[PDB]
Symmetry: D2
Subunit: 255 residues, 4 copies
């Protein structure tokens, strides 16, 4: 069956995506910086009858990404979809932004996506066909969010890469799209809430409260809500879609 590699699949949205893709019929490579959670997710999948393999990789490292993609391609017998999902999101008061903070966020969120794109392109060529590249964006990648200058800008960058890649890779039978979540219940958001709440000298949940006011559907997102959109982007039903970054955010930003 078809093969997909999902980065940051050890937990949160990445894990949800991996599980959904397995349900969709994909054999999946669980790629993550965290060896323990990657193996835990791969095990959960295999225990339920699916086909998964854990792959340790730091997406900020170009050679590691290529190695991860090739390992998955050889082991799973193919390569049809890559989901560049791994990412970090520290809240960043503008006056306190440092070169170190920018490097950390961009090396993972932006370079990681570029490396994933390149490795997938070569993998598709070696398999002798086209493919689907799916990147993790955010509604903050469409509209700069408050207190998230570095993160928001990194996601805008991902959307830019998504669009240029869609145009440049089209002749190779490759499409490039992205998914844009809103406020999702994962350790990532919990941390943003903590930083923003603490910085405002307010109780935990304050950040969630402020951002949740802009969610039209009136509830935070489940990782599965995002995975459901990614399922479409990994399916042939999205074959005629490219360069798009879909908002699966409960209606925070409208396009």
């Amino acid at each position: 069956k078809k093969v997909a590699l999902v980065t940051g699949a050890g937990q949160g949205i990445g894990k949800a995506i991996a599980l959904r893709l397995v349900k969709d019929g994909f054999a999946v490579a669980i790629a993550d910086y965290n060896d323990a959670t990657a193996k835990a997710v791969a095990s959960e999948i295999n225990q339920a009858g699916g086909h998964a393999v854990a792959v340790k990789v730091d997406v900020s490292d170009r050679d590691q990404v290529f190695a991860a993609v090739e390992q998955a391609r050889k082991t799973l017998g193919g390569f049809d979809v890559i989901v560049n999902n791994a990412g970090v999101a520290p809240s960043t008061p503008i006056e306190s932004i440092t070169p170190e903070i920018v490097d950390k966020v961009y090396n993972i969120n932006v370079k990681g996506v570029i490396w994933g794109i390149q490795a997938a392109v070569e993998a598709f060529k070696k398999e002798g066909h086209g493919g689907k590249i799916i990147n993790a964006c955010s509604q903050a990648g469409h509209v700069g969010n408050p207190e998230l200058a570095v993160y928001s800008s990194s996601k805008f960058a991902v959307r830019g890469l998504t669009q240029t890649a869609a145009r440049d890779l089209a002749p190779l039978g490759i499409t490039v799209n992205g998914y844009c979540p809103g406020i999702v219940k994962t350790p990532m958001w919990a941390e943003i809430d903590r930083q923003v709440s603490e910085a405002a000298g307010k109780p935990l949940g304050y950040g969630t409260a402020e951002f949740a006011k802009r969610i039209t559907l009136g509830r935070l997102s489940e990782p599965e809500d995002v995975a459901a959109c990614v399922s479409y982007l990994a399916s042939p039903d999205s074959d005629y879609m490219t360069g798009q970054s879909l908002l699966i955010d409960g209606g925070m930003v409208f396009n």
Copy 2:
């Protein structure tokens, strides 16, 4: 089974959407101004082993839309999705636009969508649950297309309606989204090409050639390509998406 009503389902994109929804498991109401084609499509669906009913309706007439929706709800045993697909697309040289031309296009493309939204809202309420409203937009509803002032503006209006409706109806558990095709092989585009070519003093095909140049995927769209996107919008996989007008245009416009 879940129930959906598709306007303009007698042919083209509308018919393709209806057939795809049937494959997805929906009982479908084939709504069209053309009674003969609606009945033919419904018959085809029923003879094939699916469930459908044909309803004659001019979407520009509010009472006829409510009647069509209610007939579908009673006959099919429920109402879960409405696809306001019917539309017209005459090319309109700016200096030649008349109020008659504006009325013709807007009465179907804009008013028809408003009536569909209202009728669906009442059907959902009578059923005691939420629902999905899906509107036919166009890439021309995101970026004004040359020689298509009236058509483009009508689709921008449809997207505006889609967004306000998404915000106003969210409390009722109703989502409102749209699909934006590119250049689809149906009699609608055939006519635009003929009009644009003649006005330009160029042989037939000038329109297709000019617009086709912006399609990143380098191929024209099949009605089924659009139906594949609508399938997602009709599925529970789109539950957390609202107020979006997805581009399933082969990459003509990037969002």
Copy 3:
């Protein structure tokens, strides 16, 4: 020597635009269907040393718009800029939208803009040069606003017209742009607030307070803020800008 015609110039934003354009050096035609206010504004301008003429016109009527533009062109001795500013904005709960309401709003907001574009195109042609067409849009023309389905969709339509016109008329040396205000202190907003507040059973000001929450700059808009943006759109400094609908809304929507 430059000439501009501003529709809906009898009060609010239109009047502010007219006065600013006069300060910028334009001879201005005060177009409005309100004879009293149009003549009062023209009088105010002429008494201060400026050059203006009042012109009676219901922008929903194509012939009247052409006649108004031609009267301005002949009386003021030229025609360089048209500002299609006149508009109406009733709040419209979705369930109660009627064909009459849609017609009232669209005949003024949408058709009025089309007639203005056409009339200006002919005027520029008769003057032997190009020109600037400026349309009144709204942040609600970029993102559908709650309780404003008909109004929002009409402004989305205006933006669509702005874009197609920009592309279609470029060869004639004509640019077409729009301005998008936020919450401006004029009788129009006061009425929206009254309608929304009444519908909700809230004291006057409820609507203003709710919509104001999204204004980044934390203050309501003055008609002069909008006039300052239009000044740019009417000046040669905007010569290389076309097809754009600028947000001069205090930061409600971001592009």
Copy 4:
């Protein structure tokens, strides 16, 4: 008189902006990594009757940007506007992108803007008032351009920073906007065309001609066209505008 600092003002768009701001009445700090051109431009301004000072700075370095702003603030007697204009734009075939290429482009284009924002914020606070931050974006910052993955994404990031900054800094009476040029006749574009043409094995001018096909106005941009837009963004007429990245690209992208 008001004070403005323009990075990359030694040539191209930056020089044009500086000269226009001088005409508008500003005292300007010519900041550039090229000491020769910076002093040459400052010299031309002072000899012609204006007030300017050359400041050497590599915008990729945070400390240097702060030092440049402070030198400008002390020497020119104030600080009211900053134009983070400096930038680089290499064409980058996706398969050939290296971490080195990304760092070079992002350290200048993205970090440079962050440092400028921070330095400006502190300068404004020290001057005891608000201010205007203006960043150089590009139409490629709204839509990913072919063969320009790294450059396009860096400009998307700039827009992201522009938006978050506008929201975060609003309380300080600071607005943050950007300008988006199209194809401008400067050494930067000349180099992009050379790279793209050589890569395609086609004569010089190939890239220029291909990209120019998307310019609605049908003519290449002059640095002064961009400076004209920045003039508006530096003037009080843009006081009620924030978080916007205006397209002064001849109509390549429409918002």
